[PDB]
Curated annotation (Swiss-Prot), chains A, B, C, D, E:
Its cofactor is Mg(2+). Pfam families: FBPase_3. One of its GO terms (molecular function) is fructose 1,6-bisphosphate 1-phosphatase activity. Mg(2+) 1 binds at D11, H18, D52, Q95. Consists of a single catalytic domain, but remodels its active-site architecture via a large structural change to exhibit dual activities. This is Fructose-1,6-bisphosphate aldolase/phosphatase. Homooctamer; dimer of tetramers. Dihydroxyacetone phosphate binds at H18, K133, R260, D291. GO terms for biological process: gluconeogenesis. Beta-D-fructose 1,6-bisphosphate binds at H18, Y91, G104, N105, K133, Q236, S237, R260, D291, Y352. Belongs to the FBP aldolase/phosphatase family. It comes from Pyrobaculum neutrophilum (strain DSM 2338 / JCM 9278 / NBRC 100436 / V24Sta).
């Protein structure tokens, strides 16, 4: 049968500030999706957070872009906001619920969505990712690596089915344009684009042999835009092994975001604090020093008949402690830089804050004229 | 509504020696504040320790310096002392209950108090800190950093509302005098003072734009004086982000105190051993090698209608493990110094111990006369 | 009132081999001492292990060397051996129950005993230690440090009462002789002796000012002898602070024992796996690589009216993780040495194994004669 | 007397590629400035390189912007290019000699110039810096720190003369505008600007008390622009101590440039390979892995009567080996990022390379239309 | 024969600022002492620097406090100052030549002097030390360790002649008083004093068995006072082995001084840059980051008939690279503390700078009155 796997993510209230979610937020969303399950709306679900973003992972048969699945997620976010965030006066309550109405589609309303509709396989392992304190371009490098880099994904070299490579669907979020690029041949051009992570964002990957969908990352054209993305990746059987996918994250590369959406720091692959598959909830890591560093969590599932068996915390292994130690140490090195590029983002990712405003001052003197005048201009200031 | 958030801290019995508190101490204080809640005395509370100091965090509407809130905390400390510390023959039972009477105000009676009365905000995240085995000047540097250092608090550079800086209320605990200093312009003078952490202690910080209170640190003029302080900081929304506040502690600077209140060692930001928000108790870290090193704990809350939602252990993140590893290693390096300045405090912080006494011996010879006499003075000793 | 605090330790069954104890061993010993408590035999107790040695900590009023307390401990070891070790066919079941009869005193029968009888103080914090896979001389250095080294115990320099130093009771286990030495003046001679840890063993320390007992280490003259010792130390109030005592262990010095009682490795200060003060049991660390490394555990209590409030795991602090990391790394360095001095003990601690036997071969040639004969002696071997 | 100290820097030939200079380049420039000295054109000189940029440090009395000093440096660069770079077919021979004519002033012709004209002091220590493989904004942070950061320059807090702070002359290289900012009060605005290191570049610093010049960094408005800058800083006596200046560089912050002027990596403070004050030449470090990492060198002098006594390699101290080890390790971490932001510069510093060209392809599909067409667009590619 | 070994040290000109000496300074002092040798004034000499302090080590037979030896050193410092420091306009030229006249004795005129007059032994190894950027109390800990600590000097435990310990001559530089203390018995009191390194300074050590002199450290009562000390230690043969002396320095303890004589940092044991025993000169390390860290150098000699055979750089061994790496890393950790105690010295070592001056402002409000007035006092500032 054709299942649709759908992640719909939103920040609706931080506890405290931007550090974590409140757990009743999770409890209430799980309780609500359990009604929709009972009512036949969805087959299975799982509810978790990373930092302060709630992810609603849902299986169902209404396909992509569906207004009842997108509706259900909207409704269920609205209700956490009114019943809990507003109740507890949580920080940035209702943050991502930017638009107010609700046409039919949730995209470009504030929450993030990655979905894939495929025919379920004999075995169907998927990984589900969520990052906090970063932007969707943060997965551009793990995505490139796992589907295109031979040093990460051995399957590219030694598995016949992957040998032909993958199709990359790249969204230009600035000018609302899509590029289809196909590895290996187009690797250097793909990189030419996606390496500018603020603007060219891998939205979907497709297997080239049969067209099968492989991954969908959460990204929309600017206006909303995109904070803290969520990713869905399908694994094994002519698609990256689960561990080739996990390897793509073994190096905590630097991502944009961190504190005030204006700095860069290492992407730490974190453990969940607890995973309760019976109650269908997982509590992810907190964000602490400087509001991060930025973090990604990974839960793996096996789907059967649309049911979600899992999830398993896939960054839970001593091997990832080394990675975590590295990221802690880089977060520390890079922070000693204070408010300077490249620790601080370029002015354009600044432009959305309010550095510009300030510059309502100073009085700038044009250079050619100040150059024959330096001495009295300083003489002024000095007295 | 105007809430008052009030921390009132005391060491009333160590278990064993100076290492920790007994847990029934916490249990009994929580049970007691729950009566006062029921009776309408206070809106909410939370009871925790770091090392051997019990903190009673209480919300209420009686404002600062109130004799019923200060009374309640006194009463509730007295009762732990008689019912438990004295019962179990705990070490330094009733330690901080120095005075005996109880005029109206608790300050200068032994326990430490930081309170703030503000109009509650749309979202109102506060952080609550407690350090053990140090002195109130230990927060002078984290306080300076989070409100005045651009390398710590990006908000100073990129958030319009903080751009104008803060007012620092500095108490001269030695001569009972207060200095108001305002950053940025007065930074170098603020530092001139507060860098002498034994004497010029940041007691309160105020936002300069509107006068809003931002932080209150626990400090009183000498006589009592001040051990193991507690700090209250309000975050977000024109005030340091929660993570800019947590960053101010990312470097385990050296603080005075540690063993016998006479040495200096790194301030380790520690995790709580357990946080039970349902029973309103948290058990902090123990103090071990050399009676520390010194440690600070951080709990974050969101206030609604005076209710304390929390607390969240905000030093609970792999990023702070690096910091903790650093502090462990410095505690080890610096200790190899034994009883020597600067590992050992200057003589004046010694003067309150009993190095002076000793020096009831030796016989000191005046120099000018010993200089023509060295040879027979040694000839003596030798025989 | 005068309490006696009494630790009586024995290895009666390893699970598996020499790695740990079986937990019913602990359960059964706790159940048994609870009868004796009920019957008035003893005031309080606590039952724990480190590696494969069971420690019975008991409070009571029968004073030192008492035959009912020593009897109770014997009886209760015999019963674990018959009811559990023998039942489960545990390794080296009944190991330390060497003698067979039972005159009146347990010392020189196999188990280890440290006791102190003192008048209980206003506050009376004691620490209770147990090491596995080493010998009683392993505490010679922590003992020296905490009572005699100014770099460890600041109290020696800055506390008037300790300024006069301590009396060291040193047992020569080889020739059954006792030396009384008193620090500071006799430091160099104390060291001359105790630095030979296999033979001159600090058995007791006494405060010099008033004669008060301070510490008692578990040691008996050879025949039995002594494996895996237990130590009792009283803290605070003119005696080392609890943290000066814990500092004496902050450096994992090398001790004799480890694997087959014939090697040297670092003394790792370990955490307990669990501490249950309600059931009066604690499960200590396992011994793994090469049967260690060697380890010591520390539980602190506060005594009131002979009741044992505790115990607290006093090596449970991030600061001791650094120490633990160091010890892991030295255990690794030193092991690459294989069977060579000094990783391997001197021949005399070998002499109690069976290196000697072997040397029933080779044929040794006397040197003076072999020297004019080398060439044909090799010519032989070669053909 | 009023001396002018003048550094005029140029890349005129790499050996090999971009790694170093050829030593006859240095030899020939020294030989040439020795004529000009003999002829009275200049008082003293010193000739050194870092990476592949030659620095001509010259003392003289013709003041700033002088056409004979700028001429002499031009002439002497032209002659190295024709007599050596072109001779040996060195890489990028004559690179920085962009313009062809020579009006009167060297600025905006390709080479970099920092000069200061001051009255020589009783003692007059200056430091002279040169960086390779970076851009002039690389010194924005060391410059800010040494004149404005109290954590770097203790003199700001404890020296009366510096207490009043400094004037920062900031050039907007993009719109040819100058900003005068004065610390402390304007710190946050200074940072608002200079933290965008690609565009707002500290060109000069002046002491605020008397107007004295303190530092001049090498920077010109875009067209030329600016690679690998050179800095001149005066030290001591109401101006940063020599070591407060050296401290500003103790943390290898990330700078733009490195390989192909398109990446960011740590600024390594390097030693010179040799310093020959008798022949007035110093050979700086090579640039190796990935064409760096980027590096800065420091030579200190004492001026007397315009004579340059020195120079001393001021990064030659074990303390800077730690810094160097850190930078090596970051260069290694950050490089594993390949062609991705922030390791790779933002598109705008790309725009001067030729990423744009490429994008002569792919065919971009507008999003709104591709969204109802995905399936056949992939069906295409797949077949 | 009775030789006198005499070190007389002075800072007379830094190159640049405070980083090093100019080498002609050394050359000229060596040339000058070679005349005095030729003339019979002195038997042998050696001339070296550490940081910016020149040491004149001289052997001779005029005994301690001699006016011709002290004169010769004065004269020879004056001449370097006029002929070189003043010539080259070096920084702080003539710095230590504070007084102007010259009664007979050099002590309390600015330079530092350590001398010992002993009967030369069958073999007579001495070590000669010089530290820069610290104060004479910096050797208090190495001095204590090598003569009194059994963990440093094994000879105390295992060599019969040292078993009786040493006499410590302690100068109270604040009240011009001398204390004779004798180890072991007086260890704790010695420490009580010398651990306050700013005031109780070990000036001389004497062997207790025969009265022999062992060490003399450079220290005078305040007025002058004391910067950057020099130490002379005699080794072997009932006195610490050369390596027990070198061990006393194996841990880079924190010392007062560093930058602006107002901070604390690790004492790095450094190598000499070059040792030329034929020309009788050695060039020591430079001081760089933050004007240090502080450093000590060690040259060993063998005396025969007063001739100085040597010197050997005794910190030149890979084993000391570990120590040097540690010190680099601590210098880095502790510096992140900026202007705060204990990185910054206590106010009293401040009092000699000019923190006090500043505090000509702010207006301090007395506390009791400000406490009922806070709100309008902030209302003021805010408007
Ligand atoms: Mg948020
Ligand atoms: Mg978020
Ligand atoms: Mg206490
Ligand atoms: Mg306390
Ligand atoms: Mg066993
Ligand atoms: Mg055992
Ligand atoms: Mg080039
Ligand atoms: Mg270049
Ligand atoms: Mg100097
Ligand atoms: Mg000096």
């Amino acid at each position: 049968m054709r299942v649709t796997v759908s992640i719909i993510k939103a920040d609706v209230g931080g506890f405290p500030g931007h550090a974590h979610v409140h757990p009743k937020m999770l409890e209430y969303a799980a309780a609500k999706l359990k009604e929709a399950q009972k009512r036949g709306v969805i087959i299975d679900y799982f509810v978790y957070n990373v930092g302060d973003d709630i992810s609603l992972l849902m299986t169902h048969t209404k396909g992509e872009d569906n207004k009842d699945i997108h509706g259900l997620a909207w409704e269920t976010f609205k209700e956490v906001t009114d019943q809990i965030a507003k109740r507890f006066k949580l920080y940035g309550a209702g943050q991502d619920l930017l638009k107010d109405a609700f046409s039919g589609n949730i995209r470009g309303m504030g929450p993030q969505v990655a979905e894939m509709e495929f025919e379920e396989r004999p075995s169907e392992p998927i990984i589900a990712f969520a990052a906090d304190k970063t932007e969707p371009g943060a997965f551009n490098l793990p995505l490139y690596k796992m589907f295109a880099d031979p040093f990460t994904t051995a399957g590219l070299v030694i598995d016949p089915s992957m040998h032909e490579g993958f199709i990359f669907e790249v969204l230009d979020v600035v000018e609302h344009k899509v590029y289809l690029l196909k590895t290996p041949e187009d690797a250097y051009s793909l990189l030419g684009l996606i390496g500018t992570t603020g603007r060219y964002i891998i939205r979907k990957v497709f297997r080239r042999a049969d067209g099968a969908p492989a991954a969908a990352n959460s990204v929309e054209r600017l206006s909303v835009g995109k904070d803290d993305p969520v990713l869905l990746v399908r694994a094994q059987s002519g698609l990256p092994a689960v561990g080739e996918v996990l390897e793509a994250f073994a190096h905590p590369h630097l991502v944009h975001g961190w504190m005030r959406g204006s700095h860069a720091g290492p992407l730490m692959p974190a453990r969940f604090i607890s995973v309760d598959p019976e109650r269908r909830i997982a509590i992810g890591p907190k964000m602490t020093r400087f509001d991060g560093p930025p973090k990604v969590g990974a839960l793996g599932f096996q789907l059967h008949e649309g049911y979600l068996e899992g999830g398993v915390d896939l960054f839970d292994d001593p091997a990832f402690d080394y990675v975590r130690q590295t990221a802690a140490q880089i977060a520390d090195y890079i922070r000693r830089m204070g408010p300077f590029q490249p620790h601080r983002l370029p002015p354009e990712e600044m432009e959305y804050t309010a550095l510009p405003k300030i510059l309502a001052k100073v009085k700038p003197y044009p250079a050619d004229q100040y150059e024959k005048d330096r001495k009295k201009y300083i003489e002024a200031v000095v007295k």
